[PDB]
Design a protein around this ligand. Structure first.
Ligand SMILES: NC(=O)C1=CN([C@@H]2O[C@H](COP(=O)(O)OP(=O)(O)OC[C@H]3O[C@@H](n4cnc5c(N)ncnc54)[C@H](O)[C@@H]3O)[C@@H](O)[C@H]2O)C=CC1
Ligand SMILES: NC(=O)C1=CN([C@@H]2O[C@H](COP(=O)(O)OP(=O)(O)OC[C@H]3O[C@@H](n4cnc5c(N)ncnc54)[C@H](O)[C@@H]3O)[C@@H](O)[C@H]2O)C=CC1
Ligand SMILES: O=CNC1CCCCC1
Ligand SMILES: O=CNC1CCCCC1
Ligand SMILES: [Co+2]
Ligand SMILES: [Co+2]
Ligand SMILES: [Zn+2]
Ligand SMILES: [Zn+2]
Lengths: 374, 374
């Protein structure tokens, strides 16, 4: 009834940076070749969506943001083979094209046909499928989920289990998979190790879940907001430190606590001071430090190269190092087999028309994750 | 007629900074508990020994430097259950105590008993076995090979095969296994990969040899001294670039050459700007950059943490990551099973006395190694 026809629906347009999302009528063009139109069911509010608003993340505007989501395929374009109308899918803000040198590499997952490095805010072919108030409107990371209907390229969508509870597994689109992957696939946390997690937000809690799944002996959570401590021990943190409670700098504190340094340290905040600090607190001969948080744009850190030269490893990752197309289905299937929980991360559920309340709730620090439902 | 008895011999004493070595009669003391005294046969002249003259490396003075050597044991103290008078040994500037947190780790090698973090110029008991002109002379990294006889601790020495040539295998004591180990053990160069090696001195050539043995398909050597390209190509470099020759930054050049980045990059110079350059020229999603060169005292580098967030890995190491007491005896039999050559590294052979000319050589930049013969 709608296949091949323009669809009119509501979307949260961001006309300019640091303002309010405006629920407006939009036209959604039908999918062209190797494109997929999806009817959204639930979308999460992630810190990266706020960075677009605050200007912390530069992407062309006006934009339809959002990138944690689950939806139902409404129609598929010419040549699509991997999904089907009626299929449950999750958009992938990191594509997996299967052809470039990164997709061929056994480990790397930053596919070269992504929209992170040099955001164009368009589809793969360079156009836009969104028109509102007569004019055209930009995409976000090739996903754009803050809309009732969206169009994504086939390389940016993964089919999942048809029984999945869509309104919970949308976290696998970013928040959970990122933190969980940073532990088990990027840092490759070893059993019996000691871990330090800087940041007890949604992503940081998922790091802890990863560390625990890897069987870490001790998992120390670090956050200046002590209210985030309860949830952290809930999901596996063995102890929690507030750096404000200590006279010494925190890397010193964590070094003493761990008898000379932690085996794995995770920066899950997005600050340059805590990146250098996370690296310092891991053991000098073979600590591993993973950067998960995204710093403010175009801005360098200072660090002493001596920290690395004694044996430290310093690495970072997008989307927890997971090849998206490949890993999202397997992650959903592990959730269906109850191999990990996602309820502890969901603190607020709001109808989609309340997107601005969900965002005001993120800047408040109250939420871990707010889910918008359509 | 030497055991337990004080020995007099010639030794290269460094009385202060920025001065020529002074070959003098010294009093080498007897081995105490768990110590070993060694008569030297051949010793190398590495950059680190020169950094002690200038000030690029602080350690107490007067000192008997030198850390790359081979000799034979003459006598041993009480508790020595690992070597015997007359067997060939190589002193290790990185000890392997076998009891500390690092020595028991599967991967670490920066043993906590070193004298690198807080150099202190003594044996492990805090005293000195060297006396010259009546005054106690400090040690250097627990080795001190610029003397005809020396006393090291048991943890700072490994027995090698009894038929090995001591005018060649001494480079396993530093130069070779540092560079070689950085490729094969630290980076773990995968076979079929593209490598970029910054700096084509003694250590850099060793990195290159590690890259070939690892099965690398392309090995690009980077140096501003185009006189080093011949050896580089002789021992494995497929290509050599001089950054002075190009109108563009060298990492742009290397990114084009490698079609978007190298798999592994190595900084074997010791400069802050080439460290972030080497990191940048390796593939943004799965590249690995190993720091081997040692920078000047203090002086923090500045870098964009976005280089790591996309998937890069950045690490450094001491002694190529080799656990010293274990690896050294192995790497010698390797040379004894002819798994690799050490001829192209040794360029100048001087009698020990004329030590200074060897440094003049080194500062000249005219050589790879120079071996001093006893
Ligand atoms: N590399 C990737 O692929 C991804 C990166 N991210 C980034 O992960 C980071 C964390 O994400 P969320 O948990 O959702 O954000 P969040 O704001 O909910 O969590 C941040 C936590 O860090 C705490 N914190 C703030 N300053 C601190 C300080 N000086 N010291 C210690 N703790 C401090 C805060 O109290 C807060 O609890 C974000 O920067 C996000 O952009 C998001 C997902 C994927
Ligand atoms: N991490 C560890 O365990 C150890 C570290 N090292 C360090 O390795 C480094 C190199 O060792 P060597 O080969 O013996 O010294 P070297 O002086 O023979 O080699 C340095 C090379 O770098 C070249 N170079 C200088 N500036 C350059 C620039 N801007 N761009 C490109 N090339 C440049 C020079 O032409 C020179 O050939 C030293 O800094 C040494 O302290 C040495 C032994 C062990
Ligand atoms: O949080 C989701 N995506 C992020 C990944 C890191 C760069 C900014 C966008
Ligand atoms: O070259 C030998 N030893 C080096 C090891 C790294 C720090 C400086 C001294
Ligand atoms: Co996100
Ligand atoms: Co050396
Ligand atoms: Zn790809
Ligand atoms: Zn040890």
């Amino acid at each position: 009834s709608t296949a091949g026809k323009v669809i009119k629906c509501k979307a949260a347009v961001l006309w300019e940076e640091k303002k309010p999302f405006s629920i407006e009528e939009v036209e959604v063009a039908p999918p062209k070749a190797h494109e997929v139109r999806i009817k959204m069911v639930a979308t999460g509010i992630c810190r990266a969506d706020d960075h677009v608003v605050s200007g912390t993340l530069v992407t062309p505007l006006p934009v339809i943001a959002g990138h944690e989501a689950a939806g139902i395929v409404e129609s598929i374009g010419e040549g699509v083979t991997t999904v089907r109308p009626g299929d449950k899918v999750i958009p992938l803000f990191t594509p997996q094209c299967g052809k470039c040198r990164v997709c061929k590499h056994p480990e790397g997952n930053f596919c070269l046909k992504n929209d992170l490095s040099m955001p164009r805010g368009t589809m793969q072919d360079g156009t836009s499928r969104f028109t509102c108030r007569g004019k055209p409107i930009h995409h976000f990371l090739g996903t754009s989920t803050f809309s009732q209907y969206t169009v994504v390229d086939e390389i940016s969508v993964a089919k999942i289990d048809a029984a999945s509870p869509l309104e919970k597994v949308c976290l696998i689109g970013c928040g959970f998979s990122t933190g969980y992957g940073s532990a088990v696939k990027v840092a490759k946390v070893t059993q019996g190790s000691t871990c330090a997690v800087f940041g007890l937000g949604g992503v940081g809690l998922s790091v802890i879940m990863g560390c625990k799944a890897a069987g870490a002996a001790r998992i120390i959570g670090v956050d200046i907001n002590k209210d985030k401590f309860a949830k952290a021990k809930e999901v596996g943190a063995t102890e929690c430190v507030n750096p404000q409670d200590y006279k010494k700098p925190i890397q010193e504190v964590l070094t003493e606590m761990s008898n000379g340094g932690v085996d794995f340290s995770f920066e899950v905040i997005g600050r340059l001071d805590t990146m250098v600090t996370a690296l310092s607190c891991c053991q000098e001969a073979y600590g591993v430090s993973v950067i998960v948080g995204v710093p403010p744009d175009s801005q360098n850190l200072s660090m002493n190269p001596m920290l690395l030269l004694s044996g430290r490893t310093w690495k970072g990752a997008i989307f927890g190092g997971f090849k998206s197309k490949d890993s999202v289905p397997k992650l959903v299937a592990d959730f269906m087999a109850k191999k990990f929980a996602l309820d502890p991360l969901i603190t607020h559920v709001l109808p989609f028309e309340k997107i601005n309340e969900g965002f005001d709730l993120l800047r408040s620090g109250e939420s871990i994750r707010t889910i918008l439902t359509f």
